[PDB]
Swiss-Prot record:
Disease: X-linked agammaglobulinemia: Humoral immunodeficiency disease which results in developmental defects in the maturation pathway of B-cells. Affected boys have normal levels of pre-B-cells in their bone marrow but virtually no circulating mature B-lymphocytes. This results in a lack of immunoglobulins of all classes and leads to recurrent bacterial infections like otitis, conjunctivitis, dermatitis, sinusitis in the first few years of life, or even some patients present overwhelming sepsis or meningitis, resulting in death in a few hours.
Top-level taxon of origin: Eukaryota
Gene behind the chain: BTK
Tissue specificity comment: Predominantly expressed in B-lymphocytes.
Organism field: Homo sapiens (Human)
Self-association and partners: Part of a complex composed of EEIG1, TNFRSF11A/RANK, PLCG2, GAB2, TEC and BTK; complex formation increases in the presence of TNFSF11/RANKL. Binds GTF2I through the PH domain. Interacts with SH3BP5 via the SH3 domain. Interacts with IBTK via its PH domain. Interacts with ARID3A, CAV1, FASLG, PIN1, TLR8 and TLR9. Interacts with MPL/TPOR.
Reported effect, R38G: In XLA; loss of activity
Protein name: Tyrosine-protein kinase BTK
Length: 118
């Protein structure tokens, strides 16, 4: 098995962050690809709130990806594939080689409109 919940809490992580608060703070931050996460309740799974300004909504796109869990100690956003934890799933999604130097897109939470813009 594998866990992940701990003291860690940079920005993308948030204790019970409202999906709507993520969308507004996401669009408000203006980071194309903002990424946030919060605990659920029914399955006790995690939800990833990410947004961007370059898609169906060129000026503000958002979507909360959640993880479903089956009674076989597994999780997934689509039964097509499922791991034993949310973090394990997200990591299994990228699995890219030496190309970048950091996962996730922009660590933003309930409120953190920084936007370095360089």
């Amino acid at each position: 098995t594998e866990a992940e919940d701990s003291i860690e809490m940079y920005e993308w992580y948030s204790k019970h962050m409202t999906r709507s608060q993520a969308e507004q703070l996401l669009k408000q931050e203006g980071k194309e690809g903002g990424f946030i996460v919060r605990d659920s309740s029914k399955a006790g799974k995690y939800t990833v709130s990410v947004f961007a300004k370059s898609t169906g909504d060129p000026q503000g796109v958002i979507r909360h990806y959640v993880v479903c869990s089956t009674p076989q100690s597994q999780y997934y956003l689509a039964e097509k594939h499922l791991f034993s934890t949310i973090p394990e799933l997200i990591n299994y999604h990228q699995h890219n080689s030496a190309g970048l130097i950091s996962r996730l897109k922009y660590p933003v939470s309930q409120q953190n409109k920084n936007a370095p813009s360089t």
